[PDB]
Structures are given as C-alpha cells and as structure tokens.
Write a protein that binds this DNA or RNA. Structure first.
Lengths: 18, 108, 94, 96, 341, 86, 93, 107, 79, 96
DNA sequence: AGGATGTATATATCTGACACGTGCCTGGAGACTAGGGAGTAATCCCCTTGGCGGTTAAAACGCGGGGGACAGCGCGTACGTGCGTTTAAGCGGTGCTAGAGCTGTCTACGACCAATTGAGCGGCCTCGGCACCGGGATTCTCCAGGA
DNA sequence: TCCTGGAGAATCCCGGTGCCGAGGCCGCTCAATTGGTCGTAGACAGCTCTAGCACCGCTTAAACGCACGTACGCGCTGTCCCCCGCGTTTTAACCGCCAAGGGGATTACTCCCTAGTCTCCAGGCACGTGTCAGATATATACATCCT
C-alpha cells in the first residue's frame, strides 16, 4: 500500500497565475 | 447577652465589615487576617464608591436625568484623571467614549 | 434560588449619602458591583504579596494601607488612607 | 440640490456616535461570527446571550480604541485618511 | 472490481504545511488520465497515472467546493468556485486564470455543465438560487463576457445538479437541503425567474446522478438507502402535480450514518454507482443485472501511512471515475487524494 | 467535527459598521483596505478571547459559554469588562 | 542561612540537554527568576480557576488548564504532554 | 521502614516535586493541594527550563563559548516566537537587544 | 541638576541600540523627562515597599517588586 | 583628509551597540540621579548597589524599547530623524 | 581601484569564577488516622435554540466630483563628523559604623467553636422617569450674486 | 476677491402620553455577632557582622565645545484617483410569538484523599578549593567607504 506523498508548492510542475 | 452593634456601625461605615472580613478569610490571601484589615478595606472601597458616584450623579444632572446609567459612570471616570488612571485597562459596558475630535480634522 | 451576594444595598446607601435625590439603573449597579469587586481583588492581592514578601502570615491594616498607596493614584491614595485610618481609629475606640 | 461638502457628514457622524452608546455592529451577524470562531475550539457549544453581548461590548471597545490610535498615527503622518499602515503601527507599538 | 491503490497525494496543504490533514477536499473531475481536484485554498490538476500535480491555483481564504471541465471550440477550460461565490474559469493548459464571474453573494455549493448548445454553467449557491450563465466566447485577449440567462429559486440550499440525460437543455435536476426538484431550463420560454416545476418524493438529498439514460441514482443522509428511479416513468406520471412520488426501480443498502454531504457518482459505460462512506470505504454497485440490494464490493480505507503512522480514520466525500472506469479517484477529509487503478 | 462549515461570517462585519466604529473613534476619512484590516484584527482578538472562554468552559465541565467565562478571559487579556458580573 | 534555589535542578537539565556546556552565575540567576515567575503564573491561574469553580483543591486538572491558558500553542501542547506523562508515571509507581 | 524514594524519581523528573508541593501549600493558592499537582507543575517547569536551555546553549555554541550568559538567554528567547510571547513583558539583565536595522536607514 | 548627568552621548548610545540613525537636538530634554518620570514611578514603589518592611535601605528586591508591579518583570536580581 | 559621510558612523554605532550588552549610561551620574529622585520620597535613605544596578538595567531597557518605537514613528512619518513628537506619539499609544 | 580606517582574527597571559568535593541538618518521605471534599446519581425547570412571518431600516450598488494622497523640486539649516581641550568617572585602597539579619522571650491577638438573631436576599408589586414622538426654534452649511 | 443673504437640511427643545423597571415592602434563613479558649506569630530587646557610605589619589576614557559641510526636513506645487455623499434597489436584521429539550443547578449520599502528626535520614546548601574558559593586551590580515 503506497504511503501518503506530500507535494509542496515547490513540487508543482507549474503554478497557475492570475 | 448584649445587643449586636454590627462591625460596620462601630467603624461608622456603610459597607459590610463582616462580609469583607469573610471575603479576606476565604479568598486565600493569608493564613491569618487581622481585625483592622476588613475595616480599612471597607472604608477604602466606600470612599472610592463615593467618588465615582459623586462624579456620575454630577454627570446625570448635567444630562438632565435623575438616574445613573453606564454613560454617566463612563463620563465620570474618563473626565477624572486619577480615576481614569485607576480604571485604565477597564471597559465599561454601554459607556461609549468621551467627545473628542482632533483639531486638524475640523474645517479650516 | 440560592442566595447570591452583591454590594447593591451598600452602593445605594452611599449614593443616597452623596446625592440624596438620585437613583441608579440595574446596569449601573452591575458596573458598580464589578468595580467594588475589582478594587477588592487588587488591594487584597497586594496585601497578600506584601505579607509573603515580608514573611508574615497576617494581612493587617498596615498591609491594606500600603496596598492602597501602591495601587491608587496620589490624591485618591491620600484620601483613601485618611478614610481608612479614621475608620480603624473609630472602630478601636468602640 | 444640497450636496454637503465632503467631510461635513463625516464630522456629523463623529459627533452622533461619540454622543451615543448603542452597539454599532449588528447583533445576529456578530453572534454567528462568534459561533463560527468558537467552532474550531469545541463542537456543539452553546452561548449565553450575555456571553455574546459581553464579547461584542469588548470587541467594539477594542476596535474604537484601535481606531483612535490609528487616527493619531495618521495625523502624525501629515494625513487625514487612516490606512492599513496606521493600524499596523498602532498594533505594533501596543505590543500586539 | 480488481481495483488497486495507485497514489495517495497530499497537495492541498494549508500554509504549505505537510502536517495539514484535517482540511477537507470536496470535488474532483476528469478532463475531457488527468483529474482536477479542489479543497482548501487550492485547486489542483493531477495526473492519476504518474501522481505528479500538474497545476495548482491558490486564492486566499477560499474553500473551493466544485470544479468541472468543459471542452470549448479548442480549449479544455476548468471552472472552479467556492466560499466567496465567485466562478473562476482557469485555462489550465495555458497556465493562468482567464476571468472571474462574481456569480453569488453567498457561497457557491457546486457547479455543473451540460451538452447544452454551448458554454452553459449552472451555479448553485447558498442564497437559494441556481443561476445559468452563458460565459460567451473568449476574445483575443482571454476575456469573458458572462451573461445571465435565467435564475431558479429553490426552497432550500442546492447541493448537486444533474441535467436530465435525455433532455439536458430542457429540464434540470438539483439536490437541495429540502429534497430533490426538477427545473425547466428550456430557453424558448420567456420567463426568467422560475420556481421548481416538480418536487419529488422518495429531507436533504446529498447525492444525485443518472446511472443510465433513464435511471436516476439518488441518496440522502440517515436512511442507509440509495434510490433508483426512472426519469421517463416519473415524468409520464407527472400530469400537473407540483409534488410527485417517483417511480422507484430499486433500493441499494448503504451505511446508516446520519452525516450529510456524501455525494455519489456513476460510470454509465460500466453501469456503476459509486459513493464513499464515513469509514473511507468506496461502495460500488453494478446495477446492470438489478428489499435492499447489497453493494457488489466495498473498497475499505487501506489506512495508508502518513508521517510514518497509519491514517486510521477519515471520511471520503467524492468519488469520480472515467467513462472506461480505468481510474477512480476518492477525495477525503484528510487532504489525501486517493487514486485507484 | 462539523463537516462543511462556511467560514464566511466575518463579512457580516459590514463596511458601514466598521465606518461607524471608526467615527466613534474620531476618524474622518477611511481608506478602502481599512475594512479588511479591521476584519482580520477583530478575528484575531475574538480568537484569543473565545479560546480562553472555551478553556474555562471545558474546565467547568460545561457546554454553554457563560458571561463569566468571557469576563475571566478578558481579565486574562488585561481587558477588564464591567457590567456582566465582575 | 539556607537560601533555596533551583540552581541544582537547572544544572541537571542543562547536562541532560547540553552535556558539555556550563552556565554563568548571572545566567543561573536569570533561570531561577524564570522558574519562579512561571511557578507564580501557573499557581495563580490554578488558584483563580479553583475559586471560580467553587473548589477548595488544586488538582492536576487546574494546573493543566492554567498551562493551557498561560503558555502559547505549541509550548502548551508540549507542557501538557510532559505533565500528563509525569502524572501517569507517578501514579503507576 | 522502607528505603526512601524521592517523588521526583517516581515521576522521572529532576525538579523537586516535594519543594514544589511545599511552595504550593505554603503560598496561599488553595486550602488543599492534590498529589498530582506538584508532579504536573514540576514537569512543566522542567520542560520550560530544558526548552530555554537548549536554545541558549545553541546560541552559546554559535558564538564559540562553553558557558551560557545572559546575552545567550536573550537571543534564545527573542529568536523563538513562542517564548518571546511568554516572556514578552520581561527584561533580562545584560541581555542586550537583537540586531535589527530598518531597511530605509540602510544606504 | 543631576538629570544633566545623563549626557547627550548617553542618550545617543541608547538611541543607537534602538536602531536610531539620526537624532534631533530636542530629543535630549524629552528623553531626560521620560527617564525622570519612569524613575519617579519605580522609585516611589520601591520606597513604599522599603518603608513597609521598616527598612531604611532600598534592596534590589524592592526594585524588582516595583518593576513587576508596573508590568516590567526584571530577571537577574532574585525573585 | 578622510571623512566618512553622514550616517556611516551612525550605522556603525548601531551595529556596535546592538552587538553589546554593557550599560550605556554612566553609573555614577545615574546613581546620583536615583538618590536625588528618592530623597523626594523619603530622606535619609540607603541604596544597595544591586538596587541601583536593577534600576539602571530597567531604565536602559525602557529607553531602548521607547527608542525602537520612536524610530518606527519617524519612519512612519517619512522621516529618518526622530523628533520629540515621535516620542510623544509612541508614549500615547503605549498608554503612558 | 587605492588610501585609510575600521574590523576581524590570531596568539600569549593570567586569573577568578565555575564547578567539584565534604560535612551538616532541616526539610522531605514513610506510615497512619480522621473527616470534609468531591464524585456520582436523580430530578426539575430555566434558558437556549429553532422556526416563522411581516416591517422597515440598513446595506449595497452605482455615479459624479472634489480634495486629499503622493511624487518632484528647491532651499535653508541643523545635525553628523572630526579634532582638540577639559572634566570627571572609574579603579584601588582604607576606614567607619549604620543597620540588616538573627535569636530568644512573652504575650496578645486571631483561629476555632457554639448559640442566637436580624441583615440581606428573593419575591412581589406599584408608579413615575425616561423612551418615544410630533411640532416649532435655532444653529449650522453651502452657494449665488453684489460691492 | 470676499462677504452676506437666502434656502435647505439638520439638530435641539418642548409638551403630551405611556410603559416597564427602579424602588420599596414582606417573609424567611443563614451569615454575622457574641462569648469563650488556646496556641503561636510577631513585637521587642539584644548582639553581631556585612556592606553601604565616605574619602583620597592617579589614570585615562569620555564629554564638551567648536568648525564645517551637506543630507535632509519641509514647504510648495501639480496631478490624478479614490473616497465621500447621495439616490435607488435589495436584503436580511429584528421584533414578536410559539415550541421543545439540553443541560445547568440543586440535593442526597458515600468512599477517597488529603491535612495533620510522629519518626527517621539523605538531598541540598554552605563552605572550601583547584584549574581552565574567557577577558585583556598587542600584532597582523581582511573589508569596505570615500576620493
């Protein structure tokens, strides 16, 4: 069973901007 | 036996010396409480009460009223420098604020 | 109900002393009761701290007087001390 | 028509509200806000009416005093309009 | 149903704290193996296969409640909204938010689209209204000119919408805190403010979706039952009645909890009904072959390890799978996007 | 824990209400961002006070927050309040 | 005469946390004042709680609630954990 | 009789449970003091002392010194958000102040 | 006239520890008055405590108690 | 000859005195001031050395905190120099 | 980029203050008893909550515009920096004695208990001080137009 | 360019009417008072040993005063945008009313735990003493501020 994987703001491949 | 005079009567006070003594003895302030402690504390509280009431009744008279509401107490406290210092971190319910507009904000 | 205690009657007596022809509302009476309780707590705590600091096990009138001096501003302190001294002297007399 | 110069009604409101004592925040919205905040600390909490009213009296007192300090700071800045920096300065000097 | 766990992702942390779990995630949707998920202050676009979070959009203080994709003629736009009653349409592939619609002054419960003639967006908010928007075509500069087509008044707070399968642009069903209703969404009628046309009788309805073209799957709270009823037979049995008992086809046994806002979904190509429970399980019903009938399978909460310890207790709110039922997502109240293959 | 609590009751502290509070304090002109600043400050204040009040309530093994809870909390925060049973 | 101080216990805690570190006289006096101040704060809050609830006894419950009221969040959590652990260990033995 | 076991040892504490019990009793806090209140209080005080000393010793190391001094306690307290709030109205003798210059004063 | 013993450079150094870069010429008398008021309050409290103890000497503990009274708890001198 | 421009030595002294912990006021003048103030409250009074040290520590801490607040007020007024009105505003907001 | 001033560092010295040991003794621990506290169960009625329906005040949205925030500039002065002269603070050493600290006695004041009673509190009820309100007086604001 | 008159909106003042809470009275009960005993807290005396005050001399670091130049306080000006004020529409607070039950508050009981006490000893404080971490002094390398 996979453990819970944390994905922080720096882990996102791209940020959506306004 | 003899008739009871009441300790407040002996001290010529209106606040309860016996009740204040009980409150000191049950407030866990010291293992022992002297006979003079309640008399002094009751006298002090009575004097402070007289001061606030005098100022508040003056305020009510200035406001053409015959009963003291919290506004009158607030005015009495905040217009007296020493009471304001004493009740510095105190907020009175339904008291409002003293009228005060800064000079710059008024029209030129 | 269960008997609750308040300084209403005493505040009313003092009010009739200072201003005979005036009354007080319930909210003002609650504020005055709160004021009396607060000053009681302040002076009693100061007296207890004085007794502890001086390694004494009694809150005497001397402690209450020094607490009044410490807590209350100048002129109020002077008048309060005079009133308390007069009260204790009259009490001892009788 | 009558078009009172800007600031006149502001001074009038200052006088009107410094004369009065009535609470200025509406009762039900503030009650709901109090319940919402209390929710995060406990669930199925009940509030005495007197408790909500005490919270509102204290909150309005605090906000009024804060606005007095903010106004003093704004006037210090040679200004008449209070801005967020004024509230921040007042709260910092207060130690909050 | 030979389902295996593929990812457990924690990507909607508040304050970007890995220790945030209690925050609840509410909705997810597949782009027409890419899923958009929402909860807390962030909207996340996740690849269910690889587990990478492709895109993340944050708006301060918002608690997103619904996301939905739409294919426009050729951008697959993503709509998000939540606490502040503002519908935000995000061009995920391009990487920025195009426009914002200030749709409601109260929180927006959920959003939906349909194969309407074009670009329709029903928004159901707590002001007791469902507004139908025509977001229009984007100009050269990615700007939207939203229009209001119609306002539906509801007797209670709407929770989920499902356009009628056989006439998605004529009648709309919506689940509300006071029950389920049907609203006439036909554009040829002139009146712009319309009350519920028919209130159905089977209490709030926290889950609602069509299993096939004719069968509706619905549920409430505190009943341990999922109702299957035919749209065609009900509508034929309407006449002029405003209140109409539905033609029930079957009932499915479900957990007995009285807790609300547990939503269901379907995979019509596979004849599946999906609904998470308060224990984190996924109750699956193959109603093709179909007294309270049993679930075909219960996918128990596998208690994945978090911070070196198992997350033993949680709740799953939303479960969505693709048409081919190759990937199923279950959202929890624990800031975990459960992904199953 | 309740499941879907709408944390939007701070906006009930309206713009005119904040303006009235400002006017009682002697303010003449108010900037636009003052309202959000005030909402945040009020939220922080109420959070502190209500936390202390709920702590007293839990200690008393009670489920209703009495006015004395709030009075004690304010006394803790050095904000003594008169008129509710001081 | 005997002037009681928390010096020895502070030294013990210091050797537990930094085995290779010393402490000056002024640092020791500051630590002693800190211990006494926190003692007074917690004891006073506990006394107030007991008085409010019409109780004549300061149980570990009153100390726990006093710690919660006084110390900020994470410090309060860790202090409550340490206190309850100490009480559990004391009761068991 | 039996071999004496210190109450601190039973609670696994280094601070004096007995002395704390005496101070609580001889301090006018309540008519009675429970058997667990001293343990809880000693544990809390020991925890706070350990927490302050850890940061103070870190500050001492960061200055290449073997002995903690008031400057080190000041740095430890004022660089931790939570302790600084607890001792926010406390002045530490010979502690100095944290180095801090406002941006606009810099060239 | 011992308030003048608080020299201009002393106030300058105090301001420097406070992060102040430029100091006005009128700051010095204002600071002297502020310091005098603070000392008056603290010393009044300390001497009240000393008188209560029937002592003619002001101890560090009297000052500590006065400071704690005024909400200025001081560590490093007992208590 | 060489001459640092105005402000350079100011920053240098800020850094120097924030690095140190030694009392900045001279001890003898402060002791004289303390005795002069005390004599107005009770004549023929003796001071423990530690008492004057405590008074000086408290006074310096108070003045440094007040100067931090004063500097903040000056910056608020779009000024780099602190003036008496800055101290007055700081103290008024502090409740003094 | 260099000159100069300061800072940082590098080492030797020495030293006094930390930390370790030993002896003593007072506070803590073990064991025991006795009674008031506080936990717990039952009961009851108050107060909290929840809903509904209508009325109206308040909020909200928008529109026009003026005045206030804010940047740019110019000037004059007041404060930072440096140098040289003067002052007195700090250090040390000595001496004196005021009074803070401790000890012993003895005794007067305060805790405790029991009996008696009336002061204060809950409850109940009546009327007048204040909330409200409709009309007139005044004072306050703002703009057009003449002097 | 300024002032004055006039209208217009607002607020204050005043007389009429009503309503519900302040203020007084009644009955009861428990908290304060009185009378007495006992024990120890502290008030006072006597003794002693610190340490607080005074004084004096020498060194040298800091303060003081003056010069001088320039960075900044601030006064003014212009621009523009954003907050005020006011009309209109939308909304929901608020009042009154009814209804239900959750739980606070009280009461009776009973076991537990803690205060108080006697006894015994070891944990902690005072005192004494050795040595090494840090302050001091002097010399050399690195940073950087202004020309």
């Amino acid at each position: 069973v996979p453990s819970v994987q944390f994905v922080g703001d720096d882990d996102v491949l791209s940020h959506i901007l306004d | 036996r003899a008739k009871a005079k009441t300790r407040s009567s002996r001290a010529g006070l209106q606040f309860p010396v016996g009740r204040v003594h009980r409150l000191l003895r049950k407030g866990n302030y010291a293992e022992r409480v002297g006979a003079g402690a309640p008399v002094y504390l009751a006298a002090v509280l009575e004097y402070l009460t007289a001061e606030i009431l005098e100022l508040a009744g003056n305020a009510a008279r200035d406001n053409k009223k015959t009963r003291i509401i919290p506004r009158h107490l607030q005015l009495a406290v905040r217009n007296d420098e020493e009471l304001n210092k004493l009740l510095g971190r105190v907020t009175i319910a339904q008291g409002g604020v003293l009228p005060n507009i800064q000079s710059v904000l008024l029209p030129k | 109900k269960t008997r609750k205690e308040s300084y209403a009657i005493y505040v009313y007596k003092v009010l009739k002393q200072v201003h005979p022809d005036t009354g007080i509302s319930s909210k003002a009476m609650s504020i005055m009761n709160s004021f009396v309780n607060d000053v009681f707590e302040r002076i009693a705590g100061e007296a207890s701290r004085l007794a502890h600091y001086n390694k004494r096990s009694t809150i005497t009138s001397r402690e209450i007087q020094t607490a009044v001096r410490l807590l209350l501003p100048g002129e109020l302190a002077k008048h309060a001390v005079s009133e308390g001294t007069k009260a204790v002297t009259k009490y001892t007399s009788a | 028509p009558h078009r009172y110069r800007p600031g006149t009604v502001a001074l009038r409101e200052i006088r009107r509200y410094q004369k009065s004592t009535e609470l200025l925040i509406r009762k039900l919205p503030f009650q709901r806000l109090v319940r919402e905040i209390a929710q995060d600390f406990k669930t199925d909490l009940r509030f005495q009416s007197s408790a909500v009213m005490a919270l509102q009296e204290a909150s309005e007192a605090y906000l009024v005093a804060l606005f007095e300090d903010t106004n003093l700071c704004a006037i210090h800045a040679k200004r008449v309009t209070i801005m967020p920096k004024d509230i921040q300065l007042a709260r910092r000097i207060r130690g909050e | 149903l030979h389902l295996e766990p593929l990812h457990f992702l924690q990507c909607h942390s508040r304050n970007n704290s890995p220790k945030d779990l209690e925050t609840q995630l509410w909705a997810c949707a597949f782009e027409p193996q890419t899923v958009a998920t929402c909860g807390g202050e962030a909207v996340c676009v996740i690849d269910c296969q690889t587990g990478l979070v492709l895109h993340k959009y944050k708006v301060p203080g918002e608690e997103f409640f619904s996301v939905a994709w739409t294919a426009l003629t050729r951008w697959n736009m993503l709509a998000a909204a939540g606490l502040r009653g503002m519908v935000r349409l995000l061009h995920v592939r391009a990487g920025f938010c195009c426009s914002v619609i200030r749709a409601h002054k109260k929180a927006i419960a959920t959003l939906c689209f349909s194969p309407t003639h074009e670009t329709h967006l029903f928004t159901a908010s707590y002001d007791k209204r469902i507004i139908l928007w025509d977001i229009g075509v984007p100009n050269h500069d990615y700007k939207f000119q939203a229009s209001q087509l119609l306002t539906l008044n509801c007797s209670s707070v709407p929770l989920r919408l499902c356009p009628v399968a056989t006439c998605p642009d004529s009648f709309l069903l919506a689940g509300c805190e006071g029950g389920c209703g049907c609203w006439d969404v036909r554009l040829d009628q002139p009146q712009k403010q319309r009350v519920c046309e028919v209130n159905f009788v089977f209490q709030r309805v926290d889950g609602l979706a069509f299993v096939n073209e004719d069968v509706v799957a619905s549920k409430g709270s505190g009943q341990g039952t999922i109702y299957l009823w035919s749209w065609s037979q009900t509508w034929a049995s309407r006449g002029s009645q405003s209140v109409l008992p539905v033609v029930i086809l079957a009932q499915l046994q479900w957990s007995p909890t009285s807790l609300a806002y547990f939503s269901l979904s379907t995979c019509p190509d596979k004849n599946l009904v999906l609904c998470g429970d308060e224990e984190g399980s996924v109750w699956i019903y193959d109603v093709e072959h179909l007294t309270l009938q049993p679930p075909t399978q219960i996918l128990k909460w596998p208690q994945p390890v978090a911070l070196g310890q198992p997350v033993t207790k949680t709740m799953v709110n939303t479960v969505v799978a693709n048409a081919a039922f190759t990937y199923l997502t279950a959202l929890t109240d624990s800031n975990i996007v459960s992904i199953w293959k | 824990r309740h499941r879907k609590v709408l944390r939007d009751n701070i906006q009930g502290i309206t713009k005119p209400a904040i303006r009235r509070l400002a006017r009682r304090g002697g303010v003449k002109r108010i900037s636009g961002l003052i309202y959000e600043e005030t909402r945040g400050v009020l939220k922080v204040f109420l959070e502190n006070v209500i936390r202390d009040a709920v702590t007293y309530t839990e200690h008393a093994k009670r489920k209703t927050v009495t006015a004395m809870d709030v009075v004690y909390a304010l006394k803790r925060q050095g904000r003594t309040l008169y008129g509710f049973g001081g």
